[PDB]
RNA sequence: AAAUUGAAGAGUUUGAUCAUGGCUCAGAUUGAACGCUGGCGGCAGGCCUAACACAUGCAAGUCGAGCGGAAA
């Protein structure tokens with residue numbers, strides 16, 4: 465499987481005695497639409513090579529997230545650098561109500577119904593890190609019951 | 622039974638960066654106005670300004686089973 469999205473391309477510069485070496489950063493996200501998601505950030509002097517590098521990096525850095533059949537089990541907060549993300553489970557039909565970067569991550573991860581907001585910096589590179597920080601923080605009701613030595617019933621009763 | 626199902630961001634400071642932080646934009650709205658354009662219908666709405674000044678007509682009469690009457 466592995467759906468791969470390109471969140472951002474950006475032209476960066478190193479100043480040099482000559483003039484300016486201009487290069488390209490690519491922020492990509494990969495996942496299986498069913499719990500795995502990874503990001504990759506690649507650099508190169510050509511755009512295709514950056515995307516390629518990012519994709520390769522992404523594949524290696526993928527991570528399980530506990531989803532509730534296309535939504536979250538509970539609300540989560542993420543933070544990275546100055547980017548803060550809130551995401552909340554939603555009813556089916558809602559769609560991914562996330563903003564930029566955050567929606568790419570949620571697409572490939574397999575979230576179809578979520579409510580989001582991104583506070584603070586909306587810098588793609590940081591949002592993506594916050595989003596996957598948050599998706600990492602999610603636990604299934606079973607996991608939460610396992611940890612508290614109770615049953616899914618008793619947790620919710 | 623139901624009385625809800627709800628939350629998007631982008632541009633712009635730098636050679637580049639990340640932050641901070643303004644500014645700006647996408648939405649919805651309206652007793653609107655203006656420009657261009659303009660077929661019909663239904664239902665609403667229509668001096669937000671000068672509590673400015675107002676021509677003209679009209680917007681509070683009715684009762685003869687209260688009364689003397691009798692203009693017609």
Ligand SMILES: CN[C@@H]1[C@H](O)[C@H](NC)[C@H]2O[C@@]3(O)C(=O)C[C@@H](C)O[C@H]3O[C@@H]2[C@H]1O
Nearest residue numbers: 477478479480481482483484485486509
């Ligand atoms: C004195 N010779 C210089 C010296 O080799 C410089 N490197 C320290 C060399 O640097 C270059 O190669 C550069 O990259 C910068 C450019 C302006 O000059 C080029 O030619 C520069 C040469 O002219």
